[PDB]
Amino acid sequence: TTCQFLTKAVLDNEREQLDSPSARIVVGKLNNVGTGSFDVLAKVPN
Amino acid sequence: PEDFQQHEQIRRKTLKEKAIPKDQRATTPYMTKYERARILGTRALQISMNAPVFVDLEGETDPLRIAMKELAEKKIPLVIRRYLPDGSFEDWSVEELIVD
Amino acid sequence: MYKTEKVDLALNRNRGDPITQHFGFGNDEWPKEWLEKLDEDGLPYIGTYVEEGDPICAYFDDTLNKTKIKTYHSSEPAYIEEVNLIGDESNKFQELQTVSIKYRIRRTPQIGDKF
Amino acid sequence: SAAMYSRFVKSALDDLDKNDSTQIGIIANQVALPSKNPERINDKNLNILLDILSSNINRIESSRGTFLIQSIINFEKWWELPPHTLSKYIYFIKILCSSIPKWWQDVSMILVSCFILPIKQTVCHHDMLKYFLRMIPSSMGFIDTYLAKFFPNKNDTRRKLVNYTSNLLKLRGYCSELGFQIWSLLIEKIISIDVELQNELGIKELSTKLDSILTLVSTHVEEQVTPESLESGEGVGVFNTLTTLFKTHVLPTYYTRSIQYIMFHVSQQQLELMDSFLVTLIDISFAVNEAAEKKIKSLQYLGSYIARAKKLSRTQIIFVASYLTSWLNRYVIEREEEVDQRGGMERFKHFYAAFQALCYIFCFRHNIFRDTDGNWECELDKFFQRMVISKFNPLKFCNENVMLMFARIAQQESVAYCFSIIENNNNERLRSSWSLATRQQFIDLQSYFPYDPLFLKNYKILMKEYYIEWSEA
Amino acid sequence: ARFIKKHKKQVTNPIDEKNGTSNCIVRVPIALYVSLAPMYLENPLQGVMKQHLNPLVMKYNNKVGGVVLGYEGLKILDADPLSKEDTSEKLIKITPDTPFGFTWCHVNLYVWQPQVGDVLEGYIFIQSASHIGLLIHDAFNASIKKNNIPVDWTFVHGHWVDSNGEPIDGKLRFTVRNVHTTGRVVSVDGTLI
Amino acid sequence: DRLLNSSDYTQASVCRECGSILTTQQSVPRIGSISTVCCRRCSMRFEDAKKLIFIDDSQIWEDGQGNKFVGGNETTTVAIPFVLKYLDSELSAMGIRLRYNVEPK
Amino acid sequence: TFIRGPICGTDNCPSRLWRIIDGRRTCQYGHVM
Amino acid sequence: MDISKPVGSEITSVDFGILTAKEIRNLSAKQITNPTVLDNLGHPVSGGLYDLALGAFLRNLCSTCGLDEKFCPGHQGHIELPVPCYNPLFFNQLYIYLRASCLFCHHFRLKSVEVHRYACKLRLLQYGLIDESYKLDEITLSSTLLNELKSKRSEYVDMAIAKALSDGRTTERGSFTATVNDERKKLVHEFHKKLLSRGKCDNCGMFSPKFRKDGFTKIFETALNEKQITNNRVKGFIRQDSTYILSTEVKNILDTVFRKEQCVLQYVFHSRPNLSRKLVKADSFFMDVLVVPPTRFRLPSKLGEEVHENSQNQLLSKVLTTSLLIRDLNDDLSKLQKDKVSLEDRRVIFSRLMNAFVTIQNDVNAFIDSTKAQGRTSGKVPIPGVKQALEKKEGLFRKHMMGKRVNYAARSVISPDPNIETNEIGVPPVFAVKLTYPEPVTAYNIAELRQAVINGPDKWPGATQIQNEDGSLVSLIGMSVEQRKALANQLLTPSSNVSTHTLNKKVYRHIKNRDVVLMNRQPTLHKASMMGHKVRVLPNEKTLRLHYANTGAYNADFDGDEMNMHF
Amino acid sequence: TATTLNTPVVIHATQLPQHVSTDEVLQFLESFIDEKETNLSSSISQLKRIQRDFKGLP
């Protein structure tokens, strides 16, 4: 019930921390599941 | 301005305290099936854009296959940063993880 | 398979209005490849092979001072079967405004056809 | 009139200090008109407007003044104004961009775009570019991009193209620092020259285009590069940047017919220029880091060059032979043992590549390798045979037409006898293996000779002094 | 109650001795977040230099509020917060979508920051009835508009003449009215009153 | 890729300062100058800013109509699904404001 | 394949736009934008 | 999405809030005032809904940025509402606080001490301190005692938050989990119940007249009852030291109550600590302006050949007319003295004003909302307002996020094949020639891609275009073999431009056997109905060929069912 | 123009700028010019002019 939950969010001055799968799809953020559950770094010499 | 610097140093310090001592690591010493796939894909991506390559191509034209080869010889200069659910993390080098 | 399409360039005109568009060719300069599909009247020769983008109709538009062209839209090519001139009643005087074109589509039975 | 107009403007400026802005705008609009419209402000009145504005430019440096200024920068065909009036326009622009550097951006853009015009008609444009490049060195940035932006397209008229390069060369000669970027632009046109000519080898068009362009470039370079200019000059600068662009553009793309003759030709101006090119080619063709295809292309260049370049000295040639046999003798001594081992004959692309080049060099210049005695420099008689009978079996893997011609000539000179090895080779063929997925690119690479004869009318004539046709050898 | 007013020219540039001009050359430490292309994965410092720093040289930069002359002591901040500032092996996080890295860096910038009010000296290179054109440190453009020159100064055909009837030449001392920075190159607006 | 790439992937401007993706626009520059990306919410009408130190040149921008503005230069680009812009737009019709926190600051 | 319109988005034409259904739009020398 | 256009900035959180009329006015590109949308020549009417400041429209260029219909992002403008309106989203909450108010002392009618006890609890819950909020209730040792009670509860909350911050348990940003959110929601409910449960004001002892509503957002005020007017004047000495009621009266009442009861409201309206320090204002429940969304979100539609107006514009222009009409009522209203001037016109002016407010309020309701609009001409069925567009049919989430129309990819009837591998898919050349990966060109693949470009769009395995380093595309479609051979020889030329130096060209090739696609048969009820298969291109085929071993997964029958191939 | 390839995503001064003596400006110009030996070329050219002025010349 989109507008109801929205009304509730506004009146709470809520922050969407963007952790749920739904929220991340909304904002275009890579999902928190899966191959996304860790970071990759490169070992560089010199 | 002086104190944003301080703020950043605190953020980055606590992040590392999540991201943790090497000798206090506690997760699996095996590379996960997920870590493997992403390591391959990402290293393949870097190969496709002229990353220095650490192995003999021997005629290979598929950058994924080149990555696989690099993985096999443990010459992939990537590090996996594993996040525990509180946001603290362990850094594991691709070479040190047991691959299978 | 047979498909019948109705081309009716009285579709815009506001009821018994002056007629802007008449089947045929104007005297301005237009492709000429057009005559491969279309007879002098601006209707297509019967039997013609027609694939997507080809002309199936030519008329002269007065408000444009140009000769325009209704094109064939199916991605499946076909042949012209019947072209009917649907004249109007209310006693003659009126020139050609409505035509029906019947396309013939070959179906050698294909993969995915049901028996 | 004369003094009435002096009033009209003097009023307009007063009226501008009051912000009415109408009078000015009336004037601006009058100057903005096209070169064609009779109603555009005439010379005499323009003389006046200009000399008044120049005398106190600060009166105009306002938002209200912008439109007027824009209208004078955008004055059509100003370079076409009568002497005296032209002079007042120039002095005005000079004055304007000095008290307000901001407008130099707008003025120079229009200037560069005029580079499509003939040399005789640009003096004023260059005079102005020279002036403000000096006083506003920071401008070199955006004005360089203009050099890019306004280059005529390949389709555009030849006179446009030929002009816009004539000017760029002129520009080069007073703004050196842009020099490299310039040469990079011309060369990168480079690619269009590569386009012109190979495929064809309308087409009649690209010929005379590409022909008009190169003949220009090379004559400007013949002048830019000279011994006097090499010790104390920017001759060095030009050679360098042309050699760099050769390594980055010509060699790789590496199927160009237009274009590698710039290096063929500048090279042979002076003995050291040749020396630098040879050693440069040698470098590229035997460097350990470079990709094999690069090494093979260089080796083709190397062999073609030695064969063709008329101004080469006997000893520079023997130099290249002495390098190749030396490098070859080592290869066979250190590596023949690897043939009956696991792998294919492709492992030795590079060997054949070099042996080709050397054979090719022998075709064109065998008459030179006999010293006074009648003996062979580099023991070519004894040397060729050794390679021909080696396990690499060069004769089978190198270009077929060269190997054939080498056979013919070598046999004639009592230098080597290959013809039975050839027989054996295409017999074994009918009845030492290499994939053919990758075996073809090699056959392709060994067929291309970057200094096989030119087919551009003029350039050819110009090259004659620097070229050995097969008939000559 | 609200401060966007923290974009107010706080140069302060000191007056000199044995001299009279303002020293505007300054050394500022910065942090900068930059991309590293995959081709530079074996030469990260080289890459940061060729991609980001080199293009800043001798151009005005909105953030340091002056022209950047050059740079010293580039350092990459290791994404591994546990390593010693010493080691020459560092981590750079790779974009999810692309092969590019992004890291923070520290470097030192040398900046010519003439603020309004400062006293500079220029070499005169042009004189019309509309402005005097100068070159500061033989490098940066200056310009004194016709009515920033004192009223009793006169002009001829040309070249300017001062309060006492003698022509001006070469070195001239002026104060900064405004610094125009958005054009192709920096330009200083100077006054003599 | 599907949401990502097929879906409506769009590089869009945000104001880092107010966190909006709806109040940015390209500046309209004088000829010769280059256009920049600015926030209509975070910037003052030029007049009002004078009416309250000297104002730097890089801090002024203009629109097509001709009004001059001071400030609003804290913009970047972020990758968002286009439909987000539509949702944000509809929400602001209803008087509702989304504020995106962007990093790095 | 013609429509004349929209010159060409390449400043070494402007040469002359036809749109293909795939939306490349193609100018004769062979820019596809 | 292009791997060679990386993005550095990243969105990390989103904050919900309310647009103030000050913000809107400042950001607005144009104030819209004309109901009329086009003129006789089909150009945008200035100051109308297609005004070019709101963005490029049709041929025309945007007057704000100067961009064309393609690169212009659109810009918002605003309408000036001549009289405040309730924001239909929030009218219920407004109703609660209005009813709870004391129109005399301007506190809530609930005793201050209780209200403070709620403020304490909610504040503790901002920091996730659930145990502490119960301990707060454990505090007890007439108006002198109460202020000491209030005070000691207050010093407990401070001490608890301080202690919680010093050890691990919270940050200044708060702590917010489900169990916390549950406790919070209960309290706010309990608080609201207690607000409305009071008759006489616990603080000054007076009775306020009761407020009643509509389903169409109108507020009535019922005058005082007999016992209650008696009770009120008895308290008359201590204070010494039905009807429609306008939205402006309501706003004034709440404005004052929100000042007085600000403390509690500061926590009722913030689930997290309010670092921003903004006051909670009554205005938040009202609109003095409407944001007109950019023109690109309000375009007309073409139903075949006929063109239809945008429905959101139809609604906005009704706001516009009413707006002009009220600005006229307001003009004649001021041209009273009536210092002279005979009273009754007072009644008629009010009549006209009530009329205006009601119908604008209806048009707003209808949009948020057609529900809040009076059913039109009994029939027709309502026209959807914005609320119904966002919520209508299956909704944005289900219709354009869960599910989407997709671009590259193919569909075909499937046919069985025992001769391909169980992990392959037999691809017809008709597909193989049209589907390209964008392949980046490198040393390792320059041979291959050269050949593809030479082969062209129509000979498989070929290519349909080339992407240059400056992002531009070049079509291989109209081309001869020589032109293609030329482009194929410049695939790997160096960079003549520092800015693009890190990029290489891309060839939009046809796909081949090295490749992987995603096969799909609907309904997709588990993940094995969408798997990756290795490509095997098969000459002369017109359908997709699939090994039997896969029927199980896909639930495929070969009875003319179709599959999707995604590349 | 400016992309993520040639332009920092963000720049911040970490301290207040420190003024430098002429002797320092000269020592810095010296080394910076040496270390860096088309846009960069025309720039060190300009730096070369500035270091000339700081030594007093034309």
Ligand SMILES: [Zn+2]
């Ligand atoms: Zn903003």
Ligand SMILES: [Zn+2]
């Ligand atoms: Zn073009």
Ligand SMILES: [Zn+2]
């Ligand atoms: Zn716009």
Ligand SMILES: [Zn+2]
């Ligand atoms: Zn009360």
